[PDB]
Amino acid sequence: TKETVYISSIALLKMLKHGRAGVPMEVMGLMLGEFVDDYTVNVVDVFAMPQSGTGVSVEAVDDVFQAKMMDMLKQTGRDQMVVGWYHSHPGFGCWLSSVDVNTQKSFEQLNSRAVAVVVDPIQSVKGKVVI
């Protein structure tokens, strides 16, 4: 089956600039948006996770820093919950490793609607973003 995932135009340039800046380390960031039933995933705004040298591990997610930043976003006009996160994979295609899947399993108990996005800011410079 195929599913249409809508992403705002403002989220594309933010996820592209974040992953393209640092070439290595495979950075990561959260997202915000809504849903329509189970067949539609909407992304409005994205969040930027802090940098860590572990390469997206179970220890690279800080619940203290995550809880404090979401309280400030609600006063700036963001009413949307977290729809998932995006992970950069420079030089490769779109695929999930054993670490990325195991890290993705940790957020299933928190929010079951989370979406793991694989973005490639390197090979997306041809005019068609590969994501």
Partner 1 sequence: HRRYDDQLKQRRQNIRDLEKLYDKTENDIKALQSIGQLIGEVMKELSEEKYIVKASSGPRYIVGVRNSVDRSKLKKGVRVTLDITTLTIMRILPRETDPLVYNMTSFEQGEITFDGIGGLTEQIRELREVIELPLKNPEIFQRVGIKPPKGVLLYGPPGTGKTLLAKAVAATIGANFIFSPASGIVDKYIGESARIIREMFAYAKEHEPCIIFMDEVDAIGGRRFSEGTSADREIQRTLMELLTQMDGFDNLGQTKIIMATNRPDTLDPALLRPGRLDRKVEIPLPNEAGRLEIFKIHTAKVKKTGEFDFEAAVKMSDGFNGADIRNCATEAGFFAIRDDRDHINPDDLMKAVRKVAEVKKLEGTIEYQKL
Partner 2 sequence: HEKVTIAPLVLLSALDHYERTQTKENKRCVGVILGDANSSTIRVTNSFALPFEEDEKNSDVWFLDHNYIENMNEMCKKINAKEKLIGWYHSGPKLRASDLKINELFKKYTQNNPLLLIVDVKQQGVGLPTDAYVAIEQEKTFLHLPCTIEAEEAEEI
Partner 3 sequence: KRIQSVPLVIGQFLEPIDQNTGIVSSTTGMSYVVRILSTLDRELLKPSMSVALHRHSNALVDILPPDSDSSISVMGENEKPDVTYA
Binding positions for partner 2, rule: CB under 8 A: 9-10, 13-14, 16-18, 20-21, 44-45, 48-51, 65, 68-69, 72, 75-78, 121, 124-125, 127, 129
Helix (H/G/I), strand (E/B), else coil: 88: strand
Nearest to 56 by CA among 15, 8, 24, 79: 24
123 binds, among partner 2, partner 1, partner 3, none (CB under 5 to 8 A by kind): partner 3
Closest to partner 1 by CB, 22 or 50: 22
Burial class of residue 67 in the structure, from the number of CB atoms within 10 Å of its CB (0-12 exposed, 13-18 middle, 19+ buried): exposed
**Single residue of 53, 77, 91, 93 touching partner 3 by CB under 8 A:** 91
Q: Are strands 84-88 and 28-31 parallel, antiparallel or unpaired?
A: antiparallel
Least distance from C-beta 45 to partner 1, angstroms? 25
